[PDB]
Structure 1
């Protein structure tokens, strides 16, 4: 319970009330491989979308709960959406975290899964952490309760405990949707406009390939890939469930820091949720010929479609087979600032 009293006196500037929680290792293992993170709070609104300041959450892992039943990581969620009096709760209201060590993996949590279980679980001197002395005397089992998670179907333990007035006001609060409805529709909107840009670039040209990346191709390429076999190019737009892991936003976050290339690569047909948001590097002493080795290793991928984004506002789609279709990236810069505030600072 070390992180509980570690960000309860630090996050009190940006947030009135702080919640203490657990994440099991089993539920967040598909967020990040090999438990590489060791956070950033950004609660987005359901009907009142906007943008909010980012709050920092101190989390430390590898340390168990008081229960021996499950052993997982520690976390905390700030609650600061409730304007003025926090007696109102916003229902169907997400809270999004950016847990990280070196930014990797994302977590989304409803306020309703949080708050329903929070009521369910119930000549100087040196300065003393009065919260630390008050935390130490509870030390019991029923402070922690297991609550199912609506995003990912697992039990997420919250630890609340009759500590002080700050949690004391918390369980007395009650009040009388569309928060994940927007982010899917937004990403599919920009994916539809990108596929329309590729449609008009294939239309103003002949229906042909320019083949930016060289790779050798067999004679049976029109057989083993059928005539107008755009099955992957059909279903590409359904396969992009994520955006903030995608390389599509990696160009927009890298405009201010200069310009490299980013790759969203997907399986020809359901071979696995492959890869999102990687780098093609010209900075290190691998150099431009080292980046060209990566790009020909990209074009030689015979079982994956590829999408390329540049940081300067251009988008490409590399077919398996070295073929490519040029395209444009440009969008209304309100959504640029929207994504830039969704990730971090403007």
Structure 2
């Protein structure tokens, strides 16, 4: 409980009121799979159930510890309707956002530590109370935001196909087996590709990072790619940076976004389709408030 007295000297800087917390390891396993990283970097954020938002309070830098109860394993130490957001990370690039709903922090402070139900992930979360001192719309905004943006990109791809007399060419010199005779059903390629492109949504997708570029000089020479398996053979990876191999390996749909607003759909076999990126100042600003 040392980080709690560590905060409160300067805790009043960013935010008026905060809630102390503790997160089990099985709960973190949603954020950082196949790893148990420390949370020294982990920087919080805040979130409101309206267009207004404030972030970057950076509440607690907290080490792992077992709970004061003996049977508490080894967890990570640290309007009633909103989706409060937290962002964990370390010195490395292992970053994860977790959601918390009120009615769990308000009612969870019941009576000095208590378990509460976590609505987003089906596990308990522990809340410690210092003894001396329009429901579905709030989680539904980000989802439809990203869905409509990706659909705009898809419509751009479709119109660019229309400009080419409904044909495609290569821009990545990878020799195909030349055995494609409806094998893998060359139309099913683009059917399943559009499947996975329009279905998948993540706050950390390629165009998210590509919209927000620090410099003019470097990101022009920088590309942001994400390739995901065909027919959901595995998990997706978002936000790889290119300071090609991805055209070679089949069953990987590749999406490459530039800083300028160019998108590129790469299929297995090196074929490239171009699309355009368009975001209004409002959505650009919302993404800048979120990611930055």
Distance 1:118 1:183, change over 3 A: same
DSSP-derived class of the 1:96 partner: strand
> Does structure 2 retain, via aligned residues, the 8 Å contact 1:98–1:104?
yes
Question: Does 1:302 find its partner at 2:261?
Answer: no
Q: How far, CA to CA, are the matches of 2:65 and 2:72 in structure 1? A: 15
Post-superposition shift, 1:245? 2.2
Partner deviation per Cα, 1:53-79 (whole Å, 9 max, x = no partner): 54443222255554433211122xxxx
Distance 1:297 1:149, change over 3 A: same
List structure 1 segments (4+ residues) > 6 angstroms apart after TM superposition: none
> Does structure 2 retain, via aligned residues, the 8 Å contact 1:6–1:58?
no
Post-superposition shift, 1:251? 0.6
Distance 1:239 1:275, change over 3 A: farther
Q: How far, CA to CA, are the matches of 1:105 and 1:52 in structure 2? A: 15
Structure 1 range deviating more: 324-333 or 234-243: 234-243
Structure 1 range deviating more: 221-230 or 311-320: 221-230
Q: How far, CA to CA, are the matches of 1:310 and 1:15 in structure 2? A: 36
Structure 1 range deviating more: 235-244 or 63-72: 235-244
Post-superposition shift, 1:224? 2.4
> Does structure 2 retain, via aligned residues, the 8 Å contact 1:243–1:249?
no
> Does structure 2 retain, via aligned residues, the 8 Å contact 1:262–1:277?
yes
Partner deviation per Cα, 1:118-172 (whole Å, 9 max, x = no partner): 12xxxxxxxxxxxxxxxxxxxxxxx12111211111111111131229xxxxxxx
Structure 1 range deviating more: 156-165 or 305-314: 156-165
Distance 1:303 1:234, change over 3 A: closer
Aligned match of 2:231: 269
Q: How far, CA to CA, are the matches of 2:46 and 2:191 in structure 1? A: 35
> Does structure 2 retain, via aligned residues, the 8 Å contact 1:316–1:325?
yes
Partner deviation per Cα, 1:154-200 (whole Å, 9 max, x = no partner): 111111131229xxxxxxxxxx9411111100000101000001010
Q: How far, CA to CA, are the matches of 1:273 and 1:242 in structure 2? A: 13
Distance 1:300 1:62, change over 3 A: farther
Post-superposition shift, 1:237? 5.2
Distance 1:206 1:37, change over 3 A: farther
Q: How far, CA to CA, are the matches of 2:197 and 2:115 in structure 1? A: 34
Partner deviation per Cα, 1:13-70 (whole Å, 9 max, x = no partner): 2222221111111121231145465323222222344455544432222555544332
> Does structure 2 retain, via aligned residues, the 8 Å contact 1:191–1:237?
no
Distance 1:242 1:64, change over 3 A: farther
Post-superposition shift, 1:100? 1.0
Q: How far, CA to CA, are the matches of 1:33 and 1:248 in structure 2? A: 24
Q: How far, CA to CA, are the matches of 1:62 and 1:224 in structure 2? A: 55
Q: How far, CA to CA, are the matches of 1:26 and 1:235 in structure 2? A: 34
Q: How far, CA to CA, are the matches of 2:88 and 2:55 in structure 1? A: 17
Post-superposition shift, 1:228? 1.5
Post-superposition shift, 1:318? 0.6
Post-superposition shift, 1:234? 5.6
Aligned match of 1:100: 89
Q: How far, CA to CA, are the matches of 2:29 and 2:103 in structure 1? A: 23
Matches within 5 A, 1:45-56: 45-52=48-55, 54-56=57-59
Post-superposition shift, 1:333? 2.4
Post-superposition shift, 1:315? 0.9
Q: TM-score of the superposition, structure 1-length normalised?
A: 0.74
CA RMSD of aligned residues (A): 3.1
Aligned pairs, number: 283
Structure 2 unaligned regions, length at least 5: none
Distance 1:51 1:334, change over 3 A: farther
Structure 1 range deviating more: 64-73 or 272-281: 64-73
Q: TM-score of the superposition, structure 2-length normalised?
A: 0.87
Post-superposition shift, 1:239? 6.5
